[PDB]
Amino acid sequence: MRILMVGLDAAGKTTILYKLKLGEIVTTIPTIGFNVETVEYKNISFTVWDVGGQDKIRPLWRHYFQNTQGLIFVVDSNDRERVNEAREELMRMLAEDELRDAVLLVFANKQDLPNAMNAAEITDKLGLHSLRHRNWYIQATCATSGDGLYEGLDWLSNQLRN
Amino acid sequence: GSHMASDRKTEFILCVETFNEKAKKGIQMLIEKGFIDSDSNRDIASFLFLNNGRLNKKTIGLLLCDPKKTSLLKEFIDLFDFKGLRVDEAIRILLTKFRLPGESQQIERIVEAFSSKYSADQSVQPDADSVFVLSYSIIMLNTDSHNPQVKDHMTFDDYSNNLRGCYNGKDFPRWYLHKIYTSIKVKEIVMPEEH
Numbered sequence: 001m002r003i004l005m006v007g008l009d010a011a012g013k014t015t016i017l018y019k020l021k022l023g024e025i026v027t028t029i030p031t032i033g034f035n036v037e038t039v040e041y042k043n044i045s046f047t048v049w050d051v052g053g054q055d056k057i058r059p060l061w062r063h064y065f066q067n068t069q070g071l072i073f074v075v076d077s078n079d080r081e082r083v084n085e086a087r088e089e090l091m092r093m094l095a096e097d098e099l100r101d102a103v104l105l106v107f108a109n110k111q112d113l114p115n116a117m118n119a120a121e122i123t124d125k126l127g128l129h130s131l132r133h134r135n136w137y138i139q140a141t142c143a144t145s146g147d148g149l150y151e152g153l154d155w156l157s158n159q160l161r162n
Numbered sequence: 163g164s165h166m167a168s169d170r171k172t173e174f175i176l177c178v179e180t181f182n183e184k185a186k187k188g189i190q191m192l193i194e195k196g197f198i199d200s201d202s203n204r205d206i207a208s209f210l211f212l213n214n215g216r217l218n219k220k221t222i223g224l225l226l227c228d229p230k231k232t233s234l235l236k237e238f239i240d241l242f243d244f245k246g247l248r249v250d251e252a253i254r255i256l257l258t259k260f261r262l263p264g265e266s267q268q269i270e271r272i273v274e275a276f277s278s279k280y281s282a283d284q285s286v287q288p289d290a291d292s293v294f295v296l297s298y299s300i301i302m303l304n305t306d307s308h309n310p311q312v313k314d315h316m317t318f319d320d321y322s323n324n325l326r327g328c329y330n331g332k333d334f335p336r337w338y339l340h341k342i343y344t345s346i347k348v349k350e351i352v353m354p355e356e357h
């Protein structure tokens with residue numbers, strides 16, 4: 001079962017996969033090409049997908065969007081200036097024909113920061129309540145410590161299983 | 163005097179070690195010590211191209227994909243000659259002179275500059291955009307095929323389907339895409355010195 005993890009740069013995708021990793025630190029020579037950040041949890045495969053990049057290359061994304069049951073959207077809860085940009089990226093990913101039935105999990109990351117918008121506010125800024133046909137859950141988190149990461153992945157797992 | 167040569171070499175080496183850790187500082191040192199005539203994109207590109215085998219290739223790649231180094235990257239890639247070579251053959255040559263970065267945005271710049279250069283070098287006949295997509299797809303395939311973190315590898319048909327419509331609006335002939343695919347599949351792009 002496949003899950004893609006997207007989010008604006010600096011949202012915390014890498015940090016989250018670091019905590020979830022725990023696995024043997026790469027002691028091998030890096031393969032020439034793109035960075036691959038993926039991990040397995042309860043038979044589910046989660047992979048970080050950069051949504052950046054000119055439209056010219058998007059057609060090459062088609063192969064990887066097939067067989068996608070869920071999308072994890074990571075957003076920096078402290079970045080008020082780019083929250084609207086984040087909403088656009090999420091809406092562009094959800095509009096992908098291949099993700100029409102995908103289950104959505106939003107990680108309102110960086111909740112450890114003093115002025116971080118709370119889950120309720122994020123829910124409003126991202127327009128989650130406007131989604132008419134979509135199964136979603138929003139989870140407050142702090143990637144650096146690991147708070148909320150598993151609570152959110154466990155909700156996602158339970159939703160794809162049954 | 164009997165020590166000048168040996169001392170000169172040591173000066174050079176210390177500059178390189180300085181470049182390897184901090185590109186900008188190393189380059190300033192090299193220009194000041196007279197190993198590079200000036201700080202023009204042209205003089206720096208020539209130095210990188212020719213001394214590639216003595217510098218940290220990862221550092222070279224990070225210098226070349228720096229968004230503010232557009233011209234340096236263009237000047238560097240202009241020193242290659244891709245006339246009459248197929249796209250995958252040209253990409254292998256390009257990647258022997260520096261270590262390709264890992265973030266998609268960095269890879270995109272490299273592929274962008276490489277494509278427009280490769281296209282101009284030809285003046286199956288893919289336009290500028292088609293060469294870009296194809297080249298980008300090759301870096302993708304190398305990762306898909308040999309990165310141990312990847313679980314399910316593309317089969318030729320997967321690679322082929324994924325490229326539908328990318329040849330001037332239509333499809334690349336099957337034998338052409340199979341050659342490219344098999345090429346990467348059987349011969350991973352790596353840095354020889356690394357193994």
Ligand SMILES: Nc1nc2c(ncn2[C@@H]2O[C@H](COP(=O)(O)OP(=O)(O)O)[C@@H](O)[C@H]2O)c(=O)[nH]1
Pocket residue numbers: 007008009010011012013014015016109110111112113141142143144145
């Ligand atoms: N305070 C705080 N910083 C975080 C958190 N998650 C990530 N960061 C920091 O934000 C920066 C970007 O995170 P990273 O995972 O690299 O972002 P990515 O671009 O989405 O991969 C890094 O300096 C992280 O240490 C979090 O929950 N709280």
Ligand SMILES: C[C@H]1CCC/C=C/[C@@H]2C[C@H](O)C[C@H]2[C@H](O)/C=C/C(=O)O1
Pocket residue numbers: 034035036037047048049050052053057064266302303305306312
């Ligand atoms: C499953 C592996 C396949 C490797 C090839 C994919 C490249 C994607 C192209 C995209 O524009 C950036 C990459 C995107 O970030 C893909 C991440 C990844 O781990 O992909």
Ligand SMILES: [Mg+2]
Pocket residue numbers: 013014015
């Ligand atoms: Mg990252």
